[PDB]
């Protein structure tokens, strides 16, 4: 029941520039760039250049922003957690 919404979020897409407020150019990993407006559920001021946002594959409109742009692998050896070796 909740799988029907957000099912169209494929795929993660980066925007490029803005000529006007309603319409922005966006590029997706499919290699296809998409100009589109954003849904009334998200304010236009929250869209900044280089922001990966959701999409509706039917309407191509912006759905929800996704904070992480990055990064493939390289994190697991970078991230360190839990303590040891006190003073």
């Amino acid at each position: 029941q909740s799988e029907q919404p957000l099912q169209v979020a494929r795929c993660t897409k980066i925007i490029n520039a803005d000529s006007e407020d309603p319409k922005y150019i966006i590029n997706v990993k499919q290699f296809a760039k998409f100009v589109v407006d954003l849904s009334d559920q998200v304010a236009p001021t929250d869209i900044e250049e280089g922001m990966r946002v959701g999409v509706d594959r039917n309407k191509y409109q912006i759905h929800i922003p996704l904070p992480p742009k990055i990064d493939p692998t390289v994190t697991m050896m970078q991230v360190e957690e839990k303590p040891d070796v006190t003073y």
């Binding site: 980066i14 490029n16 520039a17 319409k23 150019i25 290699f31 998409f34 100009v35 191509y60 409109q61």
Partner: protein
């Protein structure tokens, strides 16, 4: 003579039929302008421009419809709706993400007054940046060409980067932060295409300013 207002209603009513076709300019299509006539085999004449799609497919559609051929030389970024392949409007500006704007800097918290004892060699600095702006009117009279590049070098700390940006605070110059090694990525042809975008904005925009660092290493 009053029939102009009568037809003005049906063109706005049919422009509303364009509105539902203008929502939304669903995808980007690279534009290539072309003019050709095909004899048949009665006669069919018209202007038709071959269009691209960023999906790597290429299509064929008549000249838009709406915005005419007056703009522009073959472009990109224009919006087009799903599989109908009609472009409603030609949309700027260029691309892409951080390539368009490397860094957005308003103004530094410090000013050129923060350097002691360097007043002799700051004048050479301050001149080359300031003189093309306010003194440009005097250059066309005397035939003076303003300097472009300036090499600022010294053993660190020399306070070079603080002094550079601080001179852009009082001159209202918009600052753009850039580094030499930032132009190297896994994918070949990135930082190289950036100058094509960067200097295109140098033609579009007025200085302002652009500052880079570590030119000696990258120039090896």
């Amino acid at each position: 003579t009053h029939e102009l207002q009568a037809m003005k209603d049906k063109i706005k009513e049919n422009s509303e039929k364009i509105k539902v076709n203008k929502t939304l300019p669903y995808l980007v299509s690279n534009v290539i302008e072309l003019l050709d006539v095909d004899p048949n085999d009665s006669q069919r004449k018209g202007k038709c421009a071959v269009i691209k799609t960023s999906t790597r497919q290429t299509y064929f559609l008549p000249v838009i419809g709406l915005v005419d051929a007056e703009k522009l030389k073959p472009g990109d970024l224009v919006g087009v709706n799903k599989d109908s392949y009609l472009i409603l409007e030609t949309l700027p500006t260029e691309y892409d993400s951080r390539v368009k704007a490397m860094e957005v800097d308003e103004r530094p918290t410090e000013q050129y007054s923060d350097i002691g004892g360097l007043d002799k060699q700051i004048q050479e600095l301050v001149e080359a940046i300031v003189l093309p702006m306010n003194h440009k009117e005097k250059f066309e009279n005397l035939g003076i060409q303003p300097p472009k590049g300036v090499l600022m070098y010294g053993p660190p700390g020399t306070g070079k980067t603080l002094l550079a940006r601080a001179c852009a605070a009082q001159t209202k110059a918009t600052f753009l932060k850039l580094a030499g090694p930032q132009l190297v990525q896994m994918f070949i042809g990135d930082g190289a295409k950036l100058v094509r975008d960067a200097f295109a904005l140098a033609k579009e925009k007025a200085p302002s300013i652009i500052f880079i660092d570590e030119l000696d290493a990258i120039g090896t």
